[PDB]
């Protein structure tokens, strides 16, 4: 997994690759790692995939109720405080490593959070097995006062470094841009540089190739009238 | 079987159109203690080869002596020792690789990762890796330790495959190497600011640069960073 | 504690035709989650119309190939330049491997060529020297992904003739070199999609009575 | 405990269970009955860790007898086996699991069919024509796979069972001191007193 | 793995399965588990594949040297003991071997020796070795007689491997049959278990538990 | 301390009436009028913002509340009771449905959950 | 010792043109010992199909649990649960046992009754959802299935072509796994008809 | 990590490096280890980042609730709350915290709370992995009642040496000055302190 | 191997040894003779680790036969037992010790006396009226302590031996498949073919 | 143990504490850790006392046999012999040795040989458990071409701090001065160096 977060002029951008693996085997070639905590607070997860998803939805659920209770739009610091206190309580057993980014009435924010409950602030962050490849790109090209277009470019380039150089990362680049005073724009499959080439042969079988012992209709309908 | 005591971090290298570049910092770490600050980890062999070594420094010094002895031995009864029968990068590597694999096979390794950079008699670039396990491989860019994780991605953006090598000048290659060393200084806790860089070119020969420093560093943005979440 | 072994990934595939044999392998070399090289040759022409690959721990792989090549050279010296037949090479490799029975070459070895009747031959070895002549053998990381596909598409396993419904098997008709290369390419393309250690490039060595020919194909680099 | 075998024939279920009880060095008993009647037409044999086997078997017996009194009705073999499976599935994630494997032989009076259920200590249930637990199946299943027919009589089932026991007595290192054999059919449960 | 060998009126039957596994992964279905030591002697493969292959081939070399020096066929007793003495030297080093050395000579008649990597050497009439040995023993014990015909003995060995192949997950692929006579062994073909199972089910009426 | 009222405060009278429920309905009767109308392509709910004082900012008092993105609620009767029911209704939509099925509850089932809460205040101690 | 490979078995699911297919082997074992050749691993609740590989006691327990939950769902909702909703229910149910999980590899397959869209999904033992467009695999021969599916699969296969593809994927994968086989079943699922086919395969 | 707090004439100054490592990888090179628990009560954190953040947040909550009821807490009180958390949960914590604060009555005060959860009031304190290398230097160079400029130089020179020898320390030198005048943040970059 | 018993009566030594050979799960053989004739009037039974037992026994046999040919003379049972003890005492401090326990039953032709020697794998030698190795003594010694007399006939020795085997067959968990019984006296060594 | 060797204008001076501990017990409080391997080639020993004594004795033998054949050995040569023993037997040794010597041609030279058996020529070297606490101090205070009196003060002050913080170091501060003039032994007692 390669995930990055990059601050820019009027907001923040988050990006991720789309490979999920089980050991050396690729389970899903187009996984969605960018998750929504709230409309304008998004995060990307590395580590135990179930934990990253579960902790996002739990805090996202409580954030929504908190937003309704307070009649205020949710803040990134609230998501952050709720995530870290939940994770700290479970002493790293919930293997969620997240980059949290978003905009709120206070402004634009970018945080990382680790499984044991520690958090960090930054203008650029990377997480996952491809984080070193991504951070190499970020440390080479990041500057202060990036534009929206420059930040999207930098973020996706950092993910690409992970895709090509980290075996744990691959396939596509997903991006989400959160700009102040605007709707967050989720860009699913922003880049697609790994389409499989056409195979040399069609493996469609002739009908009747497989040996069959018995056939029967399965009753999926309910108990019928009359 | 042993454990490394005094250690050197990344060695990084790449091919370019007319030769090879190799670089390594001047630190000898003692665990987390940055003990020795004037350690040369690039060792030239003749005027056509530079051997870059990471890992255990005591084993590095042993290898350095083996290479010194190799030059002495090659000159014995050899009228063409400074001409046709001079040591090639390929000879030096194969010798080291033999030693490394033999030593691992006796369960007593030289605890190192080694990159042999040089130019052959016919002008061909030579760049190959060997380590404590006797594992060997070649690539347009090669790096050890942290360099493998952080330098290679950056260097591979310049030379991504074999066909990029003739398109890469010595200025672009050196620039990429120097930037990679800066990135490693930002991110490797066992690195130093001081490093050595060696260029082996088929036209201009061996250029050995000592006492280089990481420069043009970005730190100013640190002033705005406060707390770890909620603190203003 | 010092671990004398490592895993350099890689996947190899040998297929024996009627009057030819292919030995293919990806050119990617790795440790853990890093790529060492996108092109590090793994299948070698050893002379006497024999091709070899020792997949797994690359240091042991290179050592074995080097010693076998050496054995071919000395076989020529000791036996009046006699050609080393594929069966004799296979038995010789068994002894090279079993010589280190208690400190094994951590590799899965495959050799390919032609037997003394000119028919395609592939031999497969375990790390300590147990070997067999086989028609079809994948080795290494993605072997479990490739072999079932080869059982189905080379040997026509579980395939029956339409209309008979399991009574008549699909007949085992001989495959051309072009047909085998298609199955090799599709095997590695599929393996590249689902296995992280497979990719970058595919190099195929084809052995016939005319000699050894090479073919290279790009694989996905992610 | 050691060997427990089961075979479902045409009109009955036959359970064979070893008589030996060994505590380490010595064989303490050679007439132990490793079974409990759960209901008039349902019998359960058992093998596993000492103490837990009988404790589990009697606990099940007590519960099925309670159900029988409350409803004035005998549960089907299937219903009993499902109840037993749940208890074992519950047990495997407990503080200290019941280390007990069981066979449930019953005659369903509604369907007029014999039924044999094999359940291990994890709560792994399967309905079988013949079954076993431990190493018993390793020696006996090749014989059962060969000779078994679904239309066998009770007498033929007993003869096939004798062949299985003979093979066990030949190739098994442990002396299990023979087996007690019981038959479950429409008339209930009875013991074969000469085997 | 399932390998067996038994003595009878017409000599020795040797039957083996063909499956090799690495964990749950089926590495091969076409393994040769009978080692043809020479035209008169057979050995079976169980435990370590290399150990069996290597040392029983080596045994063939020793047997050949014996008959060159002594101008006489080596006895099964002498051949088996060369192997058992060899593996006994290596005891503790980690060799893995469970094999039946099978032969038929003038002085001995049909003879089988179970040889094993902890140094065991046992002469016997029926042996079964491997993960599926218990299944094959059941069929063997209940159907074995000394006065079996060569045809019925061959089938019994085939049927016993099939029993093991069906029940034991690590046995299967195909069945290899051999008949050892005084004038040498005779190969009786490779028999795919998949095809054999259905054939035997129908013709014999066995495996009623399995739907076909 | 401890809540020592563990007994029902709503009970059946001789005539079969549950007094406290009837009296609660009387309180609803005194409340400001609210209504709901269902159309083919929508539903409307409305009420009067009876401002207690002209100095009060009646926009800060929400009589019509979002429960889920597709469900809204209005009331008549005691405002504070409504406010806490809205808090409970919003939460139960998550805890007993969205955290299980990954989607918001259908109207009838959320109503069923709110109804259950109100029923329990009629029987609990 | 490893709970996910004691009993063995496999499940595979595939999408086609206006159809889905889900298939499984029939083996239940105790490591090397084959115990049952009639242990079906696919279940259905209304029109939603669930395959479950792994520890057999948990397979049975989870089937009973989801029957329990989908029956209550139906009584309250007054409609049958959909594949998308059921997938979330499986995920939620597995994750609630985060630190004492069911050792299983579930696979959901079905067609949404309102949109008509084919749907498949897979899970790890603690509920992480894999919602693939093409295919989902699970069990002790998952590597083999990944290999077969990756090469044999193509999109928009007709029901009777999809049957052949998924059958050959299962069969040949199973024949390279010691702990899988002993029979196989394939479900071909269309919007308002489902066909179930038992396959003939080698019994070793 | 290299952290220190030094009392001087006008109050107290906290100092810290900015390096946070995961093994040999620098996970954050611009970390802020100087943490505010009250207006003029701050702390330097060493050990588990998760633990010390958790502790600091709880302390900040306690002192906020203290202030609402009883007015501004003393530095001693803040140290006591830190100690209570560190001592009572010593089995499950890896935290080495220095507490520094300014009162008007007490002026600048420094308390160090090592691993066990003991409290030690000191004129100055050093902690973290890098502190080992500057025990000699700091002991030789510290004086009581230094000026602001002298104390800044003392901390700058001290942490420079700690950074020079400790691989786990590095980046920028952050400082927070606590006096009657208020709260001042200072930052010093590598090009400045490396040439000292 | 498992049970080896020895009893020295008036005019002979009787050795009883189990016939079973078990390799883990299966009983591979039920007619194994766990003994070697060292000389015409000296017999050695043995039990211990697989392979080592026979290897050791045959090595001893070869050495005693060599001595017999060289000197044209049969060593006394005492002399043979001392030679065997030294070999085992030498073995216990070797790189890989012989894990073999033996009984040596011999008839001394010079003294006209039967003699039974018990030696374990450590080289612990004792001359006894009756002896055993492993767990065999735990079941049998109480019977031997009660019934044994030094003036017993060979037939009485065999009857007492039968009682010992019966007690073993009753209380031992393992099926050792009966025993082969051999008698050593002035006329040499012979096997009792019905026991 | 706290040991150091410092080159200066007229040659080199070796310095050491005198404490030898077995756990927390001081087995010898007046140990001589400054060991003579040749007339003007000495060494400071740290690590296993058995190992470093064994090594020093072997080196002394080698240099004695060297001298009989080839005349006075260089300090580099002595360091090489030390290194050969430490490197080749690294698996079975726990020795950290500083070699210091005076030639007339080369003047004062210092070589440090840490645990692995590597060699490092330095202007000055520090080693032993107590050296950790004075890396900062020594780096700040060392100058090249100091006078004899300055070098004695530098070593005295340095080892004083090492002794102050390291429980494994203590006792007297021994010193050996190596110059053209000859070999001078110095000793400094606790009452002197503790008040520095
Ligand atoms: Mg790949
Ligand atoms: Mg099988
Ligand atoms: Mg299978
Ligand atoms: Mg540093």
Swiss-Prot record, chain B:
Listed Pfam families: Proteasome
UniProt keyword list: Cytoplasm, Nucleus, Proteasome
Top-level taxon of origin: Eukaryota
Gene Ontology CC: one annotated term: nucleus
UniProt GO BP: proteasomal ubiquitin-independent protein catabolic process; proteasome assembly; proteasome-mediated ubiquitin-dependent protein catabolic process
Subcellular location: Cytoplasm; Nucleus
Segment forming the signal sequence: none
CDD domains: proteasome_beta_type_4
PROSITE patterns to which the protein is assigned, alphabetical: PROTEASOME_BETA_1, PROTEASOME_BETA_2
Main location (coarse class): cytoplasm
Record Gene3D superfamilies: Glutamine Phosphoribosylpyrophosphate, subunit 1, domain 1
Subunit-structure text: The 26S proteasome consists of a 20S proteasome core and two 19S regulatory subunits. The 20S proteasome core is composed of 28 subunits that are arranged in four stacked rings, resulting in a barrel-shaped structure. The two end rings are each formed by seven alpha subunits, and the two central rings are each formed by seven beta subunits. The catalytic chamber with the active sites is on the inside of the barrel. Interacts with CIC1.
Family assignment from sequence similarity: Belongs to the peptidase T1B family.
Note: Present with 16900 molecules/cell in log phase SD medium.
Protein name: Proteasome subunit beta type-7
Organism whose genome encodes this protein: Saccharomyces cerevisiae (strain ATCC 204508 / S288c) (Baker's yeast)
UniProtKB/Swiss-Prot annotation, chains D, I:
GO biological process: proteasomal ubiquitin-independent protein catabolic process; proteasome-mediated ubiquitin-dependent protein catabolic process
Pfam families: Proteasome (PF00227)
Modified residues (N-acetylmethionine): 1
Primary location class: cytoplasm
Compartments where located: Cytoplasm; Nucleus
GO CC annotation, single: endoplasmic reticulum membrane
Misc note: Present with 21800 molecules/cell in log phase SD medium.
Protein name stated in the entry: Proteasome subunit beta type-4
Source organism of the structure: Saccharomyces cerevisiae (strain ATCC 204508 / S288c)
Curated annotation (Swiss-Prot), chain E:
Molecular function terms, GO-annotated: endopeptidase activity; threonine-type endopeptidase activity
Superkingdom: Eukaryota
One GO cellular component, as annotated: nucleus
EC number: 3.4.25.1
Active site: 1 (nucleophile)
UniProt keyword terms in alphabetical order: Cytoplasm, Hydrolase, Nucleus, Protease, Proteasome, Threonine protease, Zymogen
Catalytic activity entry: Cleavage of peptide bonds with very broad specificity
Compartments (UniProt record): Cytoplasm; Nucleus
GO BP annotations, alphabetical order: proteasomal ubiquitin-independent protein catabolic process; proteasome core complex assembly; proteasome-mediated ubiquitin-dependent protein catabolic process
Function: The proteasome degrades poly-ubiquitinated proteins in the cytoplasm and in the nucleus. It is essential for the regulated turnover of proteins and for the removal of misfolded proteins. The proteasome is a multicatalytic proteinase complex that is characterized by its ability to cleave peptides with Arg, Phe, Tyr, Leu, and Glu adjacent to the leaving group at neutral or slightly basic pH. It has an ATP-dependent proteolytic activity. This unit is responsible of the chymotrypsin-like activity of the proteasome and is one of the principal target of the proteasome inhibitor bortezomib.
Additional note from the record: The side chain of Thr-1 acts as a nucleophile, and the N-terminal amino group acts as a proton acceptor. Present with 8530 molecules/cell in log phase SD medium.
Family membership noted in the UniProt record: Belongs to the peptidase T1B family.
Annotated protein name in UniProt: Proteasome subunit beta type-5
Segment of the intact protein contained: 76 to 287 of 287
Curated annotation (Swiss-Prot), chain F:
Subcellular location: Cytoplasm; Nucleus
Any GO CC annotation of this UniProt entry: proteasome complex
Residue ranges the record marks as coiled coil: none
Crosslink position(s): Glycyl lysine isopeptide (Lys-Gly) (interchain with G-Cter in ubiquitin): 108
Keywords: Cytoplasm, Isopeptide bond, Nucleus, Proteasome, Ubl conjugation
Keyword Cytoplasm found: yes
Gene Ontology annotations of biological process type: proteasomal ubiquitin-independent protein catabolic process; proteasome-mediated ubiquitin-dependent protein catabolic process
Family: Belongs to the peptidase T1A family.
Other comments on record: Present with 7060 molecules/cell in log phase SD medium.
Record function comment: The proteasome degrades poly-ubiquitinated proteins in the cytoplasm and in the nucleus. It is essential for the regulated turnover of proteins and for the removal of misfolded proteins. The proteasome is a multicatalytic proteinase complex that is characterized by its ability to cleave peptides with Arg, Phe, Tyr, Leu, and Glu adjacent to the leaving group at neutral or slightly basic pH. It has an ATP-dependent proteolytic activity.
Protein name: Proteasome subunit alpha type-2
């Amino acid at each position: 997994t390669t995930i990055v977060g990059v601050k820019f002029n009027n907001g923040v951008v988050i990006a991720a690759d789309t490979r999920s693996t089980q050991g050396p085997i690729v389970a899903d070639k187009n996984c969605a790692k960018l998750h929504r905590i709230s409309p304008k607070i998004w995060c990307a997860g590395a580590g135990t995939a179930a934990d990253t998803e579960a902790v996002t939805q739990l805090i996202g659920s409580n954030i929504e109720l908190h937003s309704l209770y307070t009649s205020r739009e949710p803040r990134v610091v609230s998501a952050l405080q709720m995530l870290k206190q939940h994770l700290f309580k479970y002493q790293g057993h919930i293997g969620a490593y997240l980059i949290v980014a978003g905009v709120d009435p206070t402004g634009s924010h970018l945080f990382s959070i680790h499984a044991h409950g520690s958090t960090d602030v930054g203008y650029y962050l990377s997480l996952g097995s491809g984080s070193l490849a991504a951070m190499a790109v970020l440390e080479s090209h990041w500057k202060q006062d990036l534009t929206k277009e420059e930040a999207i470019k930098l973020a996706s380039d950092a993910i690409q470094a992970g895709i090509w150089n980290d075996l744990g990362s691959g396939s596509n680049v997903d991006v989400c841009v959160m700009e102040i005073g605007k709707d967050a724009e989720y860009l699913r499959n922003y880049l697609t540089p790994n389409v499989r080439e056409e195979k040399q042969k069609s493996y469609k079988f002739p009908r009747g190739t497989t040996a069959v012992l018995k056939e029967s209709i399965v009753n999926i309908c309910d108990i019928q009238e009359e | 079987t042993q454990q490394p005591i005094v250690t050197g971090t990344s060695v990084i290298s790449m091919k370019y159109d007319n030769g090879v570049i190799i670089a390594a910092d001047n630190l000898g770490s003692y665990g987390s203690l940055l003990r020795f600050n004037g350690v040369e980890r690039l060792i030239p062999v003749g005027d056509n080869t530079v051997v870059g070594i990471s890992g255990d420094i005591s084993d590095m010094q042993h290898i350095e002596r083996l290479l010194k002895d190799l030059v002495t031995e090659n000159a014995y009864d050899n009228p063409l020792a400074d001409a046709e029968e001079a040591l090639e990068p390929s000879y030096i590597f194969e010798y080291l690789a033999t030693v490394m694999y033999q030593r691992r096979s006796k369960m007593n390794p030289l605890w190192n990762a080694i990159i042999v950079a040089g130019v052959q008699s016919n002008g061909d670039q030579f760049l190959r890796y060997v380590n404590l396990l006797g594992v060997t491989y070649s690539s347009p860019t090669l790096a050890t330790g942290f360099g493998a994780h952080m330098a290679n991605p950056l260097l591979r953006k310049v030379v991504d495959r074999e066909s990029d090598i003739p398109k890469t000048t010595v200025q672009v290659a050196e620039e990429a190497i120097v930037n990679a060393m800066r990135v490693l200084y930002y991110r490797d806790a066992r690195s130093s600011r001081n490093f050595s860089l060696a260029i082996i070119d088929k036209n201009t020969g061996l250029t050995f640069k000592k006492n280089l420093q990481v420069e043009n560093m970005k730190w100013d943005f640190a002033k705005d960073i406060k707390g770890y979440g909620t603190q203003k | 504690q010092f671990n004398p072994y490592g895993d350099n990934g890689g996947t190899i595939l040998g297929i024996a035709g009627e009057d030819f044999a292919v030995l293919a392998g990806d050119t990617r070399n790795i440790t853990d989650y890093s790529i060492n090289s996108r092109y590090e040759p793994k299948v070698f022409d050893c002379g006497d119309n024999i091709v070899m690959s020792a997949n797994g721990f690359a240091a042991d792989g290179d050592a074995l190939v080097k010693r076998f090549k050496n054995s071919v050279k000395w076989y020529h010296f000791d036996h009046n330049d006699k050609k080393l037949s594929i069966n004799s090479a296979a038995r010789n490799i068994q002894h090279l491997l079993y010589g280190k029975r208690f400190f094994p070459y951590y590799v899965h070895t495959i050799i390919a060529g032609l037997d003394e009747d000119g028919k395609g031959a592939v031999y497969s070895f375990d790390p300590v020297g147990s070997y067999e002549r086989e028609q079809c053998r994948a080795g290494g990381a993605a072997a479990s992904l490739i072999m079932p596909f080869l059982d189905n598409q080379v040997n026509f396993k579980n395939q029956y003739e339409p209309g008979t419904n399991g009574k008549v098997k699909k007949p085992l008709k001989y495959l051309s070199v072009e047909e085998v290369i298609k199955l090799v390419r599709d095997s590695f393309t599929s393996a590249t999609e689902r296995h992280i250690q497979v990719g970058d490039g595919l190099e195929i060595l084809i052995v016939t009575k005319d000699g050894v020919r090479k073919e290279f194909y790009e694989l996905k680099r992610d | 405990m050691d060997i427990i075998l089961g075979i479902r024939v045409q009109d009955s279920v036959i359970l064979a269970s070893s008589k030996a009880v060994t505590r380490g060095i010595s064989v303490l008993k050679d007439s132990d009955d490793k079974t409990r009647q759960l209901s008039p037409h349902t019998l359960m044999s058992f093998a596993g860790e000492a103490g837990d086997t009988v404790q589990f078997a009697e606990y099940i017996q007590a519960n099925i007898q309670l159900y029988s009194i409350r409803e004035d009705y005998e549960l089907s073999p299937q219903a009993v086996s499902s109840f037993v499976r749940q208890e074992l599935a519950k047990s495997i994630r407990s503080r200290r699991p019941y280390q007990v494997n069981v066979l449930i032989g019953g005659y369903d009076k509604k369907k007029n069919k014999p039924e044999l259920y094999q359940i291990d200590y994890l709560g792994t249930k399967v309905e079988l024509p013949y079954g076993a637990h431990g190493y018993s199946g390793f020696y006996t299943f090749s014989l059962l796979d060969h000779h078994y027919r679904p239309d066998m009589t009770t007498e033929e089932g007993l003869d096939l069972l004798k062949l299985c026991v003979q093979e066990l007595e030949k190739r098994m290192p442990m002396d299990f001191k023979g087996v007690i054999v019981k038959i479950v059919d429409k008339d209930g449960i009875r013991q074969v007193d000469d085997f | 793995t399932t390998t067996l060998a038994f003595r009878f009126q017409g000599g020795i039957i040797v039957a083996v399965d063909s499956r090799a596994t690495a964990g749950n992964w089926v590495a091969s279905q076409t393994v040769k588990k009978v080692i043809e030591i020479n035209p008169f002697l057979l050995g079976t493969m169980a435990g370590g594949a290399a150990d069996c292959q290597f040392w029983e081939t080596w045994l063939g070399s020793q047997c050949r040297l014996h008959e060159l020096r002594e101008k006489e066929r080596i006895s099964v007793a002498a051949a088996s003991k060369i192997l058992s003495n060899l593996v006994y030297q290596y005891k503790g080093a980690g060799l893995s071997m469970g094999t039946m050395i099978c032969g038929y000579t003038r002085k001995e008649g049909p003879t089988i020796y179970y040889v094993d990597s902890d140094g065991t050497r046992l002469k016997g009439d029926i042996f079964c070795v491997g993960s599926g040995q218990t299944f094959a023993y059941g069929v063997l014990d209940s159907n074995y007689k000394w006065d079996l015909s060569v045809e019925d003995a061959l089938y019994l060995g085939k049927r016993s491997i099939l029993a093991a192949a069906h029940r034991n997950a690590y046995s299967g692929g195909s069945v290899n049959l051999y008949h050892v006579t005084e004038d040498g062994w005779i190969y009786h073909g490779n028999h795919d278990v998949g095809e054999l199972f259905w054939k035997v089910k129908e013709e014999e009426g066995s495996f009623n538990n399995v739907i076909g | 301390m401890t809540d020592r009222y563990s007994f029902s405060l709503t009970t059946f009278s001789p005539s079969g009436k549950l007094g406290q429920i009837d009296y609660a309905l009387t309180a609803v009767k005194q409340g400001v009028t609210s209504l709901g109308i269902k159309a083919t392509n929508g539903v409307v709910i409305a009420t009067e913002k009876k401002s207690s004082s002209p100095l009060a900012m009646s926009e800060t008092l929400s009589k019509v509340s979002l429960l889920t993105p597709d469900i809204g609620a209005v009331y008549s009767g005691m405002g504070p009771d409504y406010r806490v029911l809205v808090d409970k209704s919003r939460k139960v939509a998550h805890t007993s449905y969205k955290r299980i099925y990954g989607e918001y509850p259908p109207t009838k089932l959320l109503v069923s959950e709110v109804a259950k809460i109100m029923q329990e205040a009629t029987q609990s101690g | 010792s490893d709970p996910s490979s004691i009993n063995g078995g496999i499940v595979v699911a595939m999408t086609g043109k206006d159809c889905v297919a889900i298939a499984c082997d029939l083996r239940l074992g105790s490591q090397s010992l084959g115990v049952s050749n009639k242990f079906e691993k696919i279940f259905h609740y209304g029109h939603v199909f669930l395959g479950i590989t792994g520890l057999a006691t948990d397979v049975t327990t989870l089937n009973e649990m989801f029957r329990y939950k989908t029956n209550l769902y139906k009584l309250k909702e007054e409609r049958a649960i959909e594949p998308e909703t059921f997938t979330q229910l499986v995920s939620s149910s597995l994750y609630e046992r985060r630190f004492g999980p069911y050792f299983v590899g579930p696979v959901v397959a079905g067609i949404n009754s309102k949109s008509g869209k084919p749907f498949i999904a897979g899970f790890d033992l603690i509920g992480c959802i894999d919602e693939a467009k093409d295919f989902i695999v699970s069990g002790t021969a998952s590597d083999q299935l990944f290999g077969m599916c990756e090469s044999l699969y193509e999109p928009n296969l007709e029901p009777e072509d999809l049957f052949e593809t998924i059958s050959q994927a299962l069969l040949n994968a199973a024949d390279r796994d010691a702990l899988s086989g002993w029979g196989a079943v394939v479900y071909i699922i269309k919007k308002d008809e489902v066909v179930k086919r038992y396959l003939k395969m080698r019994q070793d | 990590t290299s952290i220190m707090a030094v009392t001087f004439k006008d109050g107290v100054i906290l100092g810290a490096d900015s390096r946070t490592t995961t093994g040999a990888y620098i996970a954050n090179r611009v970390t802020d280890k100087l943490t505010r628990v009250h207006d003029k009560i701050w702390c330097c954190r060493s050990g588990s980042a998760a633990d010390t953040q958790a502790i600091a947040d709880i302390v900040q909550y306690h002192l906020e609730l203290y202030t609402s009821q009883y007015g501004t807490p003393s530095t001693e009180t803040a140290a006591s709350v830190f100690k209570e958390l560190c001592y009572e949960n010593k089995d499950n914590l890896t935290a080495g915290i220095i507490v520094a604060g300014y009162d008007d009555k007490n002026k600048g005060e420094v308390y160090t709370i090592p691993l066990g959860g003991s409290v030690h009031k000191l004129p100055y304190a050093i902690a973290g992995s890098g502190s080992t290398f500057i025990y000699g230097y700091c002991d030789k160079n510290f004086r009581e009642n230094m000026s602001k400029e002298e104390t800044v130089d003392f901390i700058k020179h001290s942490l420079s040496q700690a950074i020079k020898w400790d691989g786990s320390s590095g980046g920028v030198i952050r400082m927070v000055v606590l006096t009657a005048a208020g709260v001042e943040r200072l930052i010093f970059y590598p090009d400045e302190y490396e040439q000292l």
